[PDB]
Scaffold this active site. Structure first.
Site, PDB file in Angstrom:
ATOM      1  N   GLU A   1       0.842  -1.206   0.000  1.00  0.00           N
ATOM      2  CA  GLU A   1       0.000   0.000   0.000  1.00  0.00           C
ATOM      3  C   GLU A   1       0.881   1.262   0.000  1.00  0.00           C
ATOM      4  O   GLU A   1       0.653   2.208  -0.757  1.00  0.00           O
ATOM      5  CB  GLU A   1      -0.916   0.047   1.234  1.00  0.00           C
ATOM      6  CG  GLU A   1      -2.079  -0.949   1.241  1.00  0.00           C
ATOM      7  CD  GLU A   1      -3.144  -0.639   0.194  1.00  0.00           C
ATOM      8  OE1 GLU A   1      -3.183   0.500  -0.310  1.00  0.00           O
ATOM      9  OE2 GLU A   1      -3.945  -1.535  -0.128  1.00  0.00           O
TER      10      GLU A   1
ATOM     11  N   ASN B   1      -7.191  10.319  -5.376  1.00  0.00           N
ATOM     12  CA  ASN B   1      -8.100   9.463  -6.120  1.00  0.00           C
ATOM     13  C   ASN B   1      -8.935  10.314  -7.070  1.00  0.00           C
ATOM     14  O   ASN B   1      -9.542  11.302  -6.673  1.00  0.00           O
ATOM     15  CB  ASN B   1      -9.003   8.654  -5.191  1.00  0.00           C
ATOM     16  CG  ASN B   1      -8.224   7.660  -4.332  1.00  0.00           C
ATOM     17  OD1 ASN B   1      -7.402   6.896  -4.842  1.00  0.00           O
ATOM     18  ND2 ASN B   1      -8.500   7.653  -3.020  1.00  0.00           N
TER      19      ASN B   1
ATOM     20  N   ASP C   1     -11.559  10.404  -7.820  1.00  0.00           N
ATOM     21  CA  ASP C   1     -12.903  10.651  -7.306  1.00  0.00           C
ATOM     22  C   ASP C   1     -13.001  11.709  -6.215  1.00  0.00           C
ATOM     23  O   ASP C   1     -14.037  11.853  -5.574  1.00  0.00           O
ATOM     24  CB  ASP C   1     -13.513   9.360  -6.785  1.00  0.00           C
ATOM     25  CG  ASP C   1     -12.749   8.815  -5.624  1.00  0.00           C
ATOM     26  OD1 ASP C   1     -12.797   9.460  -4.563  1.00  0.00           O
ATOM     27  OD2 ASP C   1     -11.905   7.927  -5.852  1.00  0.00           O
TER      28      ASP C   1
ATOM     29  N   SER D   1     -11.366  11.867  -3.327  1.00  0.00           N
ATOM     30  CA  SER D   1     -11.062  11.391  -1.978  1.00  0.00           C
ATOM     31  C   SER D   1      -9.558  11.148  -1.985  1.00  0.00           C
ATOM     32  O   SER D   1      -8.954  11.123  -3.045  1.00  0.00           O
ATOM     33  CB  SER D   1     -11.783  10.085  -1.719  1.00  0.00           C
ATOM     34  OG  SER D   1     -11.091   9.021  -2.362  1.00  0.00           O
TER      35      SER D   1
ATOM     36  N   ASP E   1      -6.075   8.828  -0.103  1.00  0.00           N
ATOM     37  CA  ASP E   1      -5.642   7.741   0.786  1.00  0.00           C
ATOM     38  C   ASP E   1      -4.451   8.206   1.598  1.00  0.00           C
ATOM     39  O   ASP E   1      -3.499   8.760   1.051  1.00  0.00           O
ATOM     40  CB  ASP E   1      -5.242   6.506  -0.016  1.00  0.00           C
ATOM     41  CG  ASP E   1      -6.370   5.982  -0.874  1.00  0.00           C
ATOM     42  OD1 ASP E   1      -7.549   6.171  -0.525  1.00  0.00           O
ATOM     43  OD2 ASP E   1      -6.072   5.418  -1.937  1.00  0.00           O
TER      44      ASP E   1
ATOM     45  N   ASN F   1      -8.731   5.764   3.394  1.00  0.00           N
ATOM     46  CA  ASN F   1      -9.462   6.727   2.561  1.00  0.00           C
ATOM     47  C   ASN F   1     -10.316   7.796   3.231  1.00  0.00           C
ATOM     48  O   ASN F   1     -11.050   7.549   4.169  1.00  0.00           O
ATOM     49  CB  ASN F   1     -10.239   5.967   1.480  1.00  0.00           C
ATOM     50  CG  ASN F   1     -10.797   6.870   0.414  1.00  0.00           C
ATOM     51  OD1 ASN F   1     -11.916   7.343   0.533  1.00  0.00           O
ATOM     52  ND2 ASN F   1     -10.049   7.064  -0.659  1.00  0.00           N
TER      53      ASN F   1
END
Length: 129
Positions: free
Chosen positions: A35, A46, A48, A50, A52, A59
């Site tokens: 990760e 992201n 979208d 959002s 991480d 998230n």
């Protein structure tokens, strides 16, 4: 902060992740490796809206508040910036909640693609625990 492999394993063990929900320590260390490559400051944007954060790439849409993710619910009840700490406490507490959210460790895409079903004990090799 970039942790050593065994340095993170020990820290994770101290925080109760070994066999948490039946997931051996190797799974958690393997997840952190893929990760974030053991970098606590890791962040990923992201497409979208959002983001991480941290060693376990948690998230912002549902888990933490970063003040820039429309429709965020802050389930772990913390600012995402707390996830970029050299202290993994916030990350672990939040992780325990995520792993119990009904998808096991599948919640971490990197763990699913690179760790699931493999020989995860290789991940704590050479470690004094």
């Amino acid at each position: 902060k970039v942790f050593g492999r065994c340095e993170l394993a020990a820290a994770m063990k101290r925080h109760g992740l070994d066999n948490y929900r039946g997931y051996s320590l190797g799974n958690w260390v393997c997840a952190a490796k893929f990760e974030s490559n053991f970098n606590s400051q890791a962040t990923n944007r992201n497409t979208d809206g959002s983001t991480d954060y941290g060693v376990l790439q948690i998230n912002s849409r549902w888990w933490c508040n970063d003040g820039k993710t429309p429709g965020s619910r802050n389930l772990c009840n913390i600012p995402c910036s707390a996830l970029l700490s050299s202290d993994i406490t916030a990350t672990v507490n939040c992780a325990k909640k995520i792993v119990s959210d009904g998808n096991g460790m599948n919640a971490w895409v990197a763990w699913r693609n690179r760790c699931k079903g493999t020989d995860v004990q290789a991940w704590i090799r050479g470690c004094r625990l």
